[PDB]
């Protein structure tokens, strides 16, 4: 329960804690709470609780909460237990997981009783939040401003419920759009003509970049707790779907591409990969789009399963459910496009996926505690040939896996080597085919110093000998120049050319924040992006990169 | 008004088909702690109404309460009818079940009060049931290497007919020539179906307590070889039928926990489990019952063809891969129950029964190829009556439960174009209450029974049409009626006639005549040339006799 730099990284269901929850009887040993005590304690669940041991409590990371097993336990257990507070979530924003007297008497007694499920969110309450504010047949036929699109960056101002167009080459904020509250990523369409983003609580944003003024076209609310959205990659199906995934509801939602019409709803409760068991909170984690076949490919957490969805035929629907690892979070596609590579975080594990045959091809374990790779850093090592590399939040470790089944089969889906870079608290790692380097953040780590820097090791020197292959270190938020606070540099960007890569200097809401260019070649500061409207600046996404994979 | 209860729960001749959860009912639950506004029950009082609430609300309100074909009753809902209302309206009783072992559907005072106030209270979810629970209630009597290498006794294996002996929880194994109760097996409790493999050697049976039996005809003695608990209420059980998948899988199907489960051909080892909670197909709302009901295997491909109910999804299960698994969940039509295919073994037709509809998939392409209103009311088809009209040319005939009906639609897409997926022809047989229809491809009678109806006359009676004599006329053909229960001499009671099945060589039909499990019951069986009665099975050990599956006709799916 106390605070390591690989348990931050939990869901705080914050949107669903708004809700407001009737507060059920008591049986016989065990004493009621309240509406209003029930009430906030449900908050705190909700908020610090629910991501390690679920809204139902039926267990993640953390085991299970239910009545019977707490009960057993004990008032007095339970007391004394959380008496020492719970793990602090991600910093700027989140929990710091301190509770008073009063609080760990509601919790202890909350636990003790039989909880609700949240309301389920299905078709007719997205029909009801679903709104075409320009239809297809009124938008342009060809692009009507004179933007850069491919080299536009979408990034998210998180605690302002706005995103920021900013042209890649002049660093101009080209407008500012407002979505409501914490778009947790923006995907582009595979044209690169739409761009879509999905708020913590569900809500989706569908914006037409060929507008004069680029604006919200479309928007539906899929949940009351999501994190993912990608769209449909396959050739010949560009602009055709879009997909969101949700943590509550347990569901996926499959929406058209030019109106976001919710098209196929997928519940996502089932069985444990392996101890066959049913989860009723199955959260859909990392949502990719596959390159080989019409097929979304879908995350799901604690199940442990990967699912490969053929948008082809909504009716008849067509999945291949593949049997993975427990805890898969997030992950990306190799060079080829054809192997997805996925973190099951929580059991250090690497699961490879071939989206040809749509079949489970690997499983390995890291070295390294709590892998968290994004989308990945995919590169040709000089010595082990093609690559795919992930940092970790648990520790300092850089772990790289074969990526070439064909050119380099001893070394294909293996782990070839570990090494250190900045400290622990990393969440992305990343690379550009026209760059030589290999980026590191280390976001979380507790030492201000370390959080607010880069490493960087140069892909070309590596021999793969053994050894631990040296870093420069990029002190980023000294670059931003921010007095207050101890702002978090993390996740580098690349420009559509791979010649630039940006950082996002991020601090508090009523503090200085900033975005941090980087000149790749020389590895020397290129700008600093400095506005009054850039609040807590989060994840950037190149228009280019994102509608084609590139990383 | 609570009086609209003379309506909503009366008995109708086809609303007493829902399930009765009477396994589940078993289990003792907790008294749940009532919040403020509401009176507690104790740990007794909720017992005894959870256990009514299963047996006799559940099958149409749903374990959850969630609703079924019945409407939700959630606590929000209930308590703001209020007490009351609820007293009121539960006052008037429910739809009886089943006739001679389902509910009456009456209530005391007491047990009145016991079920408004239960309504009016929060209920836990039944235990779930995952590979844990299934392991540790597998065991493998005879190892297959311990099993013989070829058929030990002399039974004409094919010909044999496996019968279930309801209320006893047994089965009884009977001689399709000599008529010979062969052996009489116990299984602990009621068998709703059984299931050959497509060797032909082994028998399966689904317990409707999610029991699977897996019994081998090869021994000198036939017994149970393997046996494995799947869930705690189940119906359904198939097995692998794709040519070179002979006795490789086995899979069952049930209504609680809402999931299915393939297990290993020859030890009955769980190999998967999949959960059927998920999204209804049209207004895509969750539901969190989704009970599967008939489970057929493809001809076409390495699959498993599974019903799920509630959602109105067809799942087509591939077990080529059961790691990386491949399924296709077509969306049809809501109350999917039972169902079955062409005579070409390509299409699955299926009955949504509440919406009085057919479904028709392509196994094949795997898709839904048509969905057709009956014309009647609730189609209870079984797995149906294929043969070639006269006129229209091959069809596939269903009788049905509200009404007198029997509707032919058209199964040939490639031959007879115009009248492929489409109703043919309705006419009337008996009378309401209809539950099984049947033919065989060597008889040129197609066979209706009317289990169900009011009328003992009518129930127990057996409508027959000579399907040579049918033309496409649009008048309806004539029938005769076999007075099967007459022929059975049984004097107490009202016995009810059910289902017919064929012997091997589909020159004689049997019909259970059904009576209660302290009365006579007996199995009849009808010479098909003549449509005169050739024998009668009578003995004390026949104790509710209800399905009966001709080995042969099972294994190969001819009907
Ligand atoms: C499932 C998931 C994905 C994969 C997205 C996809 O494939 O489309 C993802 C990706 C991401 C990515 C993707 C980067 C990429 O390059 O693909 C970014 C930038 C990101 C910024 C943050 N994430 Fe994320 N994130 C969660 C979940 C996820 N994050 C959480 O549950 C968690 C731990 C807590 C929460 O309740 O949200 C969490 C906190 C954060 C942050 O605090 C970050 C740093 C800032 C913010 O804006 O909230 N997450
Ligand atoms: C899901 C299901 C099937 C499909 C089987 C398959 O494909 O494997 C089926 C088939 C069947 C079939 C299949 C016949 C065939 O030819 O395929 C028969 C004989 C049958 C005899 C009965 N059924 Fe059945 N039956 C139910 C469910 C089902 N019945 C119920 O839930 C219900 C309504 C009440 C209950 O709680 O069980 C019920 C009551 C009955 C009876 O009362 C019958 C008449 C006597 C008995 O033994 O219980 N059901
Ligand atoms: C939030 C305030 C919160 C509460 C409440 C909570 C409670 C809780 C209890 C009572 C236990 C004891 C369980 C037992 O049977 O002994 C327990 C145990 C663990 N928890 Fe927890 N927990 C809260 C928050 C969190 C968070 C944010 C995390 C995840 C980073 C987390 C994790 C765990 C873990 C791990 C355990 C130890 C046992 C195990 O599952 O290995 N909890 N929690
Ligand atoms: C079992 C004894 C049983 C109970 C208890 C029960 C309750 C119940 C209530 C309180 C209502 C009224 C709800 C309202 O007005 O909002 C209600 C309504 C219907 N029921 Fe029922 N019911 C019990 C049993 C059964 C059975 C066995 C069936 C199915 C054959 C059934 C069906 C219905 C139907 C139909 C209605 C009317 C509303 C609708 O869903 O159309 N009930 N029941």
């Given at each position: 329960?106390?605070?390591?730099?690989?348990?931050?990284?939990?869901?705080?269901?914050?949107?669903?804690?708004?809700?407001?929850?009737?507060?059920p009887g008591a049986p016989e040993g065990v004493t009621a709470l309240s509406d209003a005590q029930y009430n906030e304690a449900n908050?705190?669940?909700?908020?610090?609780?629910?991501?390690?041991?679920?809204?139902?409590?039926?267990?993640?990371?953390?085991?299970?909460?239910?009545?019977?097993?707490?009960?057993?336990?004990?008032?007095?257990?339970?007391?004394?237990?959380?008496?020492?507070?719970?793990?602090?979530?991600?910093?700027?924003?989140?929990?710091?997981?301190?509770?008073?007297?009063?609080?760990?008497?509601?919790?202890?007694?909350?636990?003790?009783?039989?909880?609700?499920?949240?309301?389920?969110?299905?078709?007719?309450?997205?029909?009801?939040?679903?709104?075409?504010?320009?239809?297809?047949?009124?938008?342009?036929?060809?692009?009507?401003?004179?933007?850069?699109?491919?080299?536009?960056?979408?990034?998210?101002?998180?605690?302002?419920?706005?995103?920021?167009?900013?042209?890649?080459?002049?660093?101009?904020?080209?407008?500012?759009?407002?979505?409501?509250?914490?778009?947790?990523?923006?995907?582009?369409?595979?044209?690169?003509r739409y761009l879509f983003v999905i708020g913590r609580d569900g809500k989706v944003n569908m914006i037409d970049l060929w507008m004069?003024?680029?604006?919200?076209?479309?928007?539906?609310?899929?949940?009351?707790?999501?994190?993912?959205?990608?769209?449909?990659?396959?050739?010949?199906?560009?602009?055709?779907?879009?997909?969101?995934?949700?943590?509550?509801?347990?569901?996926?939602?499959?929406?058209?591409?030019?109106?976001?019409?919710?098209?196929?709803?997928?519940?996502?409760?089932?069985?444990?990969?392996?101890?066959?068991?049913?989860?009723?909170?199955?959260?859909?984690?990392?949502?990719?789009?596959?390159?080989?076949?019409?097929?979304?490919?879908?995350?799901?957490?604690?199940?442990?399963?990967?699912?490969?969805?053929?948008?082809?035929?909504?009716?008849?629907?067509?999945?291949?459910?593949?049997?993975?690892?427990?805890?898969?979070?997030?992950?990306?596609?190799?060079?080829?496009?054809?192997?997805?590579?996925?973190?099951?975080?929580?059991?250090?594990?690497?699961?490879?996926?071939?989206?040809?045959?749509?079949?489970?091809?690997?499983?390995?374990?890291?070295?390294?505690?709590?892998?968290?790779?994004?989308?990945?850093?995919?590169?040709?090592?000089?010595?082990?040939?093609?690559?795919?590399?992930?940092?970790?939040?648990?520790?300092?470790?850089?772990?790289?896996?074969?990526?070439?089944?064909?050119?380099?089969?001893?070394?294909?889906?293996?782990?070839?080597?570990?090494?250190?870079?900045?400290?622990?608290?990393?969440?992305?790692?990343?690379?550009?085919?026209?760059?030589?380097?290999?980026?590191?953040?280390?976001?979380?780590?507790?030492?201000?110093?370390?959080?607010?820097?880069?490493?960087?090791?140069?892909?070309?020197?590596?021999?793969?000998?053994?050894?631990?292959?040296?870093?420069?270190?990029?002190?980023?938020?000294?670059?931003?120049?921010?007095?207050?606070?101890?702002?978090?540099?993390?996740?580098?960007?690349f420009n559509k050319d791979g010649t630039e890569v940006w950082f996002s200097v991020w601090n508090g809401k009523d503090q200085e924040?900033?975005?941090?260019?980087?000149?790749?070649?020389?590895?020397?500061?290129?700008?600093?992006?400095?506005?009054?409207?850039?609040?807590?600046?989060?994840?950037?996404?190149?228009?280019?990169?994102?509608?084609?994979?590139?990383?």
């Amino acid at each position: 329960h106390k605070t390591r730099t690989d348990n931050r990284y939990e869901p705080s269901l914050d949107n669903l804690a708004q809700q407001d929850v009737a507060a059920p009887g008591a049986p016989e040993g065990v004493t009621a709470l309240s509406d209003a005590q029930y009430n906030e304690a449900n908050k705190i669940y909700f908020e610090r609780c629910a991501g390690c041991h679920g809204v139902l409590r039926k267990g993640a990371t953390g085991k299970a909460l239910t009545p019977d097993l707490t009960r057993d336990l004990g008032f007095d257990y339970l007391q004394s237990f959380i008496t020492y507070a719970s793990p602090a979530g991600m910093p700027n924003w989140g929990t710091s997981g301190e509770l008073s007297a009063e609080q760990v008497d509601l919790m202890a007694n909350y636990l003790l009783l039989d909880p609700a499920a949240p309301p389920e969110f299905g078709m007719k309450e997205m029909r009801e939040s679903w709104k075409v504010h320009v239809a297809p047949e009124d938008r342009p036929t060809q692009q009507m401003n004179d933007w850069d699109l491919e080299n536009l960056f979408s990034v998210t101002l998180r605690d302002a419920g706005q995103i920021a167009l900013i042209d890649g080459s002049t660093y101009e904020i080209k407008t500012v759009l407002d979505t409501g509250y914490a778009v947790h990523i923006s995907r582009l369409s595979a044209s690169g003509r739409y761009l879509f983003v999905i708020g913590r609580d569900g809500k989706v944003n569908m914006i037409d970049l060929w507008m004069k003024e680029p604006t919200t076209v479309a928007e539906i609310k899929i949940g009351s707790e999501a994190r993912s959205i990608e769209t449909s990659k396959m050739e010949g199906w560009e602009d055709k779907y879009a997909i969101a995934g949700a943590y509550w509801p347990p569901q996926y939602v499959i929406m058209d591409g030019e109106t976001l019409e919710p098209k196929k709803i997928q519940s996502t409760r089932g069985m444990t990969y392996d101890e066959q068991e049913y989860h009723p909170e199955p959260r859909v984690a990392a949502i990719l789009a596959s390159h080989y076949r019409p097929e979304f490919i879908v995350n799901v957490k604690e199940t442990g399963k990967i699912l490969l969805v053929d948008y082809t035929d909504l009716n008849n629907l067509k999945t291949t459910e593949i049997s993975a690892e427990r805890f898969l979070h997030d992950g990306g596609l190799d060079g080829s496009h054809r192997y997805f590579i996925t973190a099951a975080n929580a059991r250090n594990k690497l699961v490879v996926i071939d989206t040809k045959e749509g079949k489970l091809v690997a499983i390995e374990d890291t070295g390294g505690q709590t892998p968290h790779p994004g989308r990945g850093a995919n590169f040709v090592h000089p010595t082990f040939g093609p690559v795919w590399a992930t940092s970790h939040m648990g520790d300092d470790s850089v772990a790289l896996i074969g990526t070439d089944p064909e050119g380099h089969p001893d070394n294909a889906w293996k782990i070839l080597d570990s090494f250190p870079a900045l400290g622990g608290g990393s969440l992305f790692i990343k690379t550009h085919p026209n760059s030589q380097y290999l980026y590191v953040d280390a976001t979380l780590n507790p030492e201000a110093e370390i959080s607010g820097s880069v490493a960087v090791f140069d892909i070309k020197a590596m021999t793969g000998d053994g050894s631990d292959p040296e870093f420069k270190t990029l002190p980023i938020a000294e670059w931003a120049g921010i007095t207050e606070g101890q702002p978090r540099v993390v996740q580098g960007e690349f420009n559509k050319d791979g010649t630039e890569v940006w950082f996002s200097v991020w601090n508090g809401k009523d503090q200085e924040s900033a975005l941090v260019v980087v000149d790749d070649k020389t590895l020397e500061l290129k700008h600093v992006i400095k506005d009054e409207r850039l609040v807590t600046p989060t994840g950037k996404f190149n228009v280019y990169n994102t509608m084609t994979d590139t990383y």
